[model samples]
Target: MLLHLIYGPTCSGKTDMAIQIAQETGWPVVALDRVQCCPQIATGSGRPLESELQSTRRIYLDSRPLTEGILDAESAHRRLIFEVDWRKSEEGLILEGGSISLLNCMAKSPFWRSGFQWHVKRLRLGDSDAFLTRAKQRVAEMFAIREDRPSLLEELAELWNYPAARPILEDIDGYRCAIRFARKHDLAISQLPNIDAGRHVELIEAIANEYLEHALSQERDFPQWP
Candidate 1:
């Protein structure tokens, strides 16, 4: 199985691009989020397990205290390449969220240097600063219109806390991740220009198919999107 990491800064459209790639391919995607990395510690009330979290046996690496029964569950049906902001002491880690430390780590890894064709996408020159500024401005405008909006405040708080989420917020990071991974692997990376909407799906499929051709050595067709 091939591991692919799709990453980008806020508003870069990583998720959309991952979905588009995954939909055209049989590959499974594990989206990087806060819940995927850290265990929620209870401030007062106990942290509830996110319902969206898969019932998989997660192997927590890098010397974190083991939570009771956390890894004693059924193995995840799908594989995961963790998305972390900071450098966790793993050698072959594919970081979904952009971090200079993680990139530095990847720079030293032979797997990354050898170009094993492991898919990882990272955008060039993240726009996190600009995105945050825009987000604050929008929130301010919304608050000006509705002063008592508690939900908006809550939403803003969540966004504010997640420093790593800015690049991945936009789906562009997904394609960027793909491009970077392809280059690292010494594989040819191609993209249909923004105007070529009709061939968007087809082009992604072609890339996926080409990857399969090289990786699996078997001719394949794109699956029907569910």
Candidate 2:
């Protein structure tokens, strides 16, 4: 079966676009995201909402809590193959994420060529102001304590207590900054104080924006991947 691979820079509306396409085409979507696989870090990893999950046949989110959502290219490549086959869908499949590593690895794999053919669609940032706005808002939501979903701090604290998940938190962008800010203020690991919430959000937002720009650059240079 053919697969639709929707890839792009961070905060580039990849997931929403993928969901839209899947809805239109009636295809399953396999997340190529690096973090959505882990269950504990939902907020930090940008896991899809229950509503989105209901709308599309989605998988890979919350699939790797033991590894703390950390995945290399080879592993991601293999996992993608398994997920598509597991679906047994002959119509087509929709794949989406900013996981460039998986794309890089798959580009070099012989199996990727013979096992399945893919059509790649890239989403681009609409504008600088909009992209920056999205980055800031996403960071805010990640650290915000909401009644609807677990905040990033909560996810981080869960990881902090669980030895298996703790180590990877330090390696992730949002969690790393949250850890540093919480350490400086000596606040609760699972919730941010209202007084310093602005500063805390700003810190993580800057890091997130920079990281996303770098990822976009890498994607541009590797556009030759088919």
Candidate 3:
């Protein structure tokens, strides 16, 4: 079975890409996203509407803090992909989220080391200035919608500056871990261009097509499991 792990910072269009892939490949999506898991912050998180995508099933693991959800779902998500019999017509699983450390941790496991091949795709925003600008706008938009969460708006505004949002926005630690893990596992990491909403569907389809080509070429080397 094909497993696709797509990750990137907030407002990076990861969901847009996932939806595009689902439409093209008929893969069920399992949201490893912490915010989406939380009903309280679902709207604030800016998750794509389910009606926008053609995925058969979209699973939300648990509703909790980001770190807690990541910790809890680390192994559980993997098990869902490798052990569960959820997919029927779907070709594979599209696991999308923002936790790179969780991805790193999963790669260190024996199951991952057991010669199973999976695809890792990272969406990188090219212009830092542009990203920050867009993030601020998104924060404002979300805050306007969720006026009940005043603290959330304050926190987001506080993190607007580079020093405050560097770690949170850029995800330095997460990317570092992801890079290291990718190197150790010999997994080829594909970096997509900066996300553009105007061409969102096109870019996602491009990434998905590339993944399909790469997977097809290696099919013979890594025989399918019974």
Indicate the worst ten consecutive residues by lDDT in candidate 1. 217-226
Angstrom error of the Cα, residue 85, model 3: value is 6.4
Best by lDDT: 2
What does candidate 1 score on TM? 0.32
Give the alpha carbon lDDT tens digit for every residue of 1-226 in model 2.
7778888777877788888888889887888876677766777878777665657777783366645348656777787777776765577888888776776766676766766667888777667677778888777767667777777667766667776665677676666667766677777665554536466656667656765675557557545555
lDDT of 2 at 72: 59
Cα displacement (angstroms), candidate 3, residue 207, comes to 29
Clashing residue pairs in candidate 3 (N, C-alpha, C atoms within 3 angstroms): none
- Top of the candidates by TM-score: 2
Residues 121-156, candidate 1, lDDT per residue (tens digit)?
A: 654323435544443343233223233332222232
Q: Rank the candidates by TM-score, best first.
A: 2, 3, 1
Give the alpha carbon lDDT tens digit for every residue of 164-213 in model 3.
33343223222233233334445422321222344434333332333233
lDDT of 2 at 218: 53
CA lDDT of every candidate: 0.32, 0.71, 0.48
Clashes of each: 24, 0, 0
**Relative to the unseen true structure, what is the C-alpha lDDT of residue 163 in candidate 2, on a scale of 0 to 100?**
67
Output the lDDT of residue 37, model 3.
Answer: 59
Candidate 2 Cα errors over 4 Å, as ranges: 66-69, 86-89, 115-117, 125-129, 184-197, 213-223
